[PDB]
Amino acid sequence: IEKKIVLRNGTEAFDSWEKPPLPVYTQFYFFNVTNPEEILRGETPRVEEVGPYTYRELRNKANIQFGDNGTTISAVSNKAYVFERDQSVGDPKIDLIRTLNIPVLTVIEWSQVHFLREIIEAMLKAYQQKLFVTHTVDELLWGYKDEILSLIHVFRPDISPYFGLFYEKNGTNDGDYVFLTGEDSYLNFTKIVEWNGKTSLDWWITDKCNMINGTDGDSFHPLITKDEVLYVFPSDFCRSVYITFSDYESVQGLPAFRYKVPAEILANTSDNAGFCIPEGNCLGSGVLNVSICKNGAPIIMSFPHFYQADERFVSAIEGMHPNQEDHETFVDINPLTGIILKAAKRFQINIYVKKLDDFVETGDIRTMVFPVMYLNESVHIDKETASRLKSMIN
Ligand SMILES: *[C@@H]1O[C@H](CO)[C@@H](O[C@@H]2O[C@H](CO)[C@@H](O[C@@H]3O[C@H](CO[C@H]4O[C@H](CO[C@H]5O[C@H](CO)[C@@H](O)[C@H](O)[C@@H]5O[C@H]5O[C@H](CO)[C@@H](O)[C@H](O)[C@@H]5O)[C@@H](O)[C@H](O[C@H]5O[C@H](CO)[C@@H](O)[C@H](O)[C@@H]5O[C@H]5O[C@H](CO)[C@@H](O)[C@H](O)[C@@H]5O)[C@@H]4O)[C@@H](O)[C@H](O[C@H]4O[C@H](CO)[C@@H](O)[C@H](O)[C@@H]4O)[C@@H]3O)[C@H](O)[C@H]2NC(C)=O)[C@H](O)[C@H]1NC(C)=O
Ligand SMILES: *[C@@H]1O[C@H](CO)[C@@H](O[C@@H]2O[C@H](CO)[C@@H](O[C@@H]3O[C@H](CO[C@H]4O[C@H](CO)[C@@H](O)[C@H](O)[C@@H]4O)[C@@H](O)[C@H](O[C@H]4O[C@H](CO)[C@@H](O)[C@H](O)[C@@H]4O)[C@@H]3O)[C@H](O)[C@H]2NC(C)=O)[C@H](O)[C@H]1NC(C)=O
Ligand SMILES: *[C@@H]1O[C@H](CO)[C@@H](O[C@@H]2O[C@H](CO)[C@@H](O[C@@H]3O[C@H](CO)[C@@H](O)[C@H](O[C@H]4O[C@H](CO)[C@@H](O)[C@H](O)[C@@H]4O)[C@@H]3O)[C@H](O)[C@H]2NC(C)=O)[C@H](O)[C@H]1NC(C)=O
Ligand SMILES: *[C@@H]1O[C@H](CO)[C@@H](O[C@@H]2O[C@H](CO)[C@@H](O)[C@H](O)[C@H]2NC(C)=O)[C@H](O)[C@H]1NC(C)=O
Ligand SMILES: *[C@@H]1O[C@H](CO)[C@@H](O[C@@H]2O[C@H](CO)[C@@H](O)[C@H](O)[C@H]2NC(C)=O)[C@H](O)[C@H]1NC(C)=O
Ligand SMILES: *[C@@H]1O[C@H](CO)[C@@H](O)[C@H](O)[C@H]1NC(C)=O
Ligand SMILES: *[C@@H]1O[C@H](CO)[C@@H](O)[C@H](O)[C@H]1NC(C)=O
Ligand SMILES: *[C@@H]1O[C@H](CO)[C@@H](O)[C@H](O)[C@H]1NC(C)=O
């Protein structure tokens, strides 16, 4: 019965893997900074939440190649974002948001450790730059031209003048994956054996932290059980995470197990100590330093409103109001199929900010992990895809 779900050009699992039937949505949430100058002079930051802005993902797998014997498959996954205005607050082309000036914050990082050179820091003093900027929502995620980057682009053309959170992530696959089909065992269904041609991460300080575990997270192995733990590799998150069983749900007419991301994942603990790039020093519970993943930028990952995290971070930034129900990330999956009936996946992007004497752009600013944006990656099972799926046996 389990044999029905494998990835091979005959099965229905494949056609639904190749072109996933269910629509998937990402909603974007920005924190609009209230007191920019007051922040620079050392006062507590205060933000206002702005969102969502709704984009429907267009998902198909490409460059599908076939296994050693029958046991492996490899491909890339192209996701594109199609904006839905009526499910969003406004038109992100018009709508404005004020936050940290991120492009300059990285080159400043690039000043202190030299990923490009210090002393071309000159461009910073030649052209006045602000640590807080205003750009349309469309601009921050889909890209805009920065004036510092534009100059630096002249001396070294490899660096792009364009900054964006999601810049050039429309329509493109991340990474080359090779995947384990269900032939050796169902348990290995859509497991990640290797990514980008390397089967491990080189980013993290220990052997265990650097492992690539489990599925990409958009599917699971059939015949799931309440006791076990499901590993997931979120490429964009720069590491692998697992989920623990929470409660029993009924989506549609069908059973589901609710798995959640346990607070342990981003917490400060001796198992997690490798996620500190300096070793013996990491920032604390509930935040991760994802810098090496992103071009040397001082970018911190956290859950929305710093949920599942030390509350000293929550205190530092006004307007952070973490609650479980909204900011948790959960997966409701069908025990038999392992198919995902409903889920919501939520990460937050933070930027590390501190006063530097070498740069007056930073003023007297407090040392803190500063919220820019978080997102809900969500999926719900349609009511006629429910019953065709509920048509089993056979
Ligand atoms: C989130 O996560 C991020 C990563 O994911 C974190 O990012 C990390 O942040 C830490 C913060 O501490 C940072 O560590 C620092 O690194 C500094 C940079 O190190 C490199 O550069 C220096 C200096 O470059 C200059 O080197 C000499 C001159 O000093 C010259 O010969 C060089 O060519 C170059 O000079 C050139 O430029 C000038 C112009 O400026 C020209 O005029 C000149 O002609 C030259 O062209 C180097 O010394 C370093 O070398 C080390 O590392 C390489 C790696 O390959 C080794 O090969 C090398 O042997 C050496 O290794 C060891 O020596 C250093 C000696 O400083 C020791 O620190 C250590 O034992 C090394 O293992 C690098 O090439 C660095 O300067 C700084 O250290 C300073 O402060 C400490 C304070 O204790 C002092 O003791 C030192 O003496 C230094 O003054 C510190 O180590 C990481 O680099 C950074 N990593 C990444 C990947 O980003 C981020 O922090 C995190 N965020 C949060 C919030 O947690
Ligand atoms: C993707 O992720 C985002 C963010 O997590 C979700 O957006 C949230 O959606 C939830 C519902 O799924 C919203 O929750 C509702 O908020 C309403 C507004 O509450 C305000 O008003 C009350 C007092 O009236 C204040 O106390 C509060 O602080 C707010 O200022 C509530 O009225 C709703 O309450 C109803 O449901 C709850 C359920 O617990 C009951 O307790 C209530 O009695 C009542 O029945 C509810 O709390 C939330 O506001 C949304 N937030 C944002 C930022 O948009 C998306 O839903 C999620 N999924 C998708 C598909 O987008
Ligand atoms: C996030 O916070 C920032 C900072 O508070 C905020 O940016 C500001 O938005 C307001 C609009 O909400 C901008 O004010 C407008 O500026 C233009 C250009 O000068 C004017 O034409 C506008 O005047 C009209 O405004 C009303 C109608 O729109 C009328 O009452 C009025 O008579 C005029 O017709 C208006 O003054 C302001 O320029 C920006 N400020 C900065 C620094 O960007 C942003 O809107 C916030 N985002 C969200 C989603 O709330
Ligand atoms: C991301 O790329 C996709 C793919 O082109 C865009 O989706 C299309 O957008 C056009 C509007 O220019 C419309 O025809 C539809 O919304 C999409 N086309 C089809 C055939 O579905 C999407 O607009 C792009 N988004 C951004 C932010 O660049
Ligand atoms: C990847 O998976 C391996 C095992 O599947 C994890 O290693 C285990 O970590 C736990 C920590 O509680 C230890 O008790 C086990 O002894 C470890 N097992 C093995 C075989 O090493 C590893 O931590 C996972 N890493 C990531 C990043 O998900
Ligand atoms: C699956 O369907 C037929 C089988 O020959 C073929 O036209 C198609 O290219 C196959 N696809 C893959 C990825 O093998
Ligand atoms: C696939 O087969 C079984 C199922 O878990 C296991 O013993 C084996 O190690 C799996 N292969 C890989 C590469 O994980
Ligand atoms: C992280 O944990 C270790 C051991 O539990 C502790 O020594 C260190 O102070 C902690 N740091 C933070 C920021 O919580």
Residue numbers in the entry: 37 to 430
Text of the article:
Here we present the structural and functional studies of SCARB2, a functional receptor of the important human enterovirus 71 (EV71). SCARB2 is ubiquitously expressed and serves as a common receptor for all clinically isolated EV71 strains, CVA16, CVA7 and CVA14. SCARB2 (residues 37–430) consists of three domains arranged in a “Kidney” shape.
To gain an understanding of the molecular basis of SCARB2-mediated uncoating of EV71 under acidic conditions, we solved the crystal structures of the ectodomain of SCARB2 under both neutral (pH 7.5) (hereafter denoted as nSCARB2) and acidic conditions (pH 4.8) (hereafter denoted as aSCARB2). In contrast the elucidation of the structure of nSCARB2 (pH 7.5) at higher resolution (3.0 Å) and its comparison with aSCARB2 enabled us to visualize a pivotal conformational change in SCARB2 induced by pH that has implications for the function of the receptor. Thus in nSCARB2, α5 (residues 157–164) adopts a short helical conformation. Helices α4, α5 and α7 are held together in a compact cluster by hydrophobic interactions involving residues W146, L152, I156, Y163 of α4–α5 and I184, L187, I188, F191, I195 from α7. Under neutral conditions, a cap closes the entrance of the lipid-transfer tunnel of SCARB2. Amongst these multiple sites, based on the contour of the electron density and prior knowledge that lysosomal enzymes are often modified with Man9GlcNA2-P, the glycan at N325 of nSCARB2 was modeled as Man8GlcNA2. N325 is located at the bottom of a cleft formed between helices α11 and α12. Man8GlcNA2 protrudes to the surface out of this chasm and stations itself in vicinity of the cap.
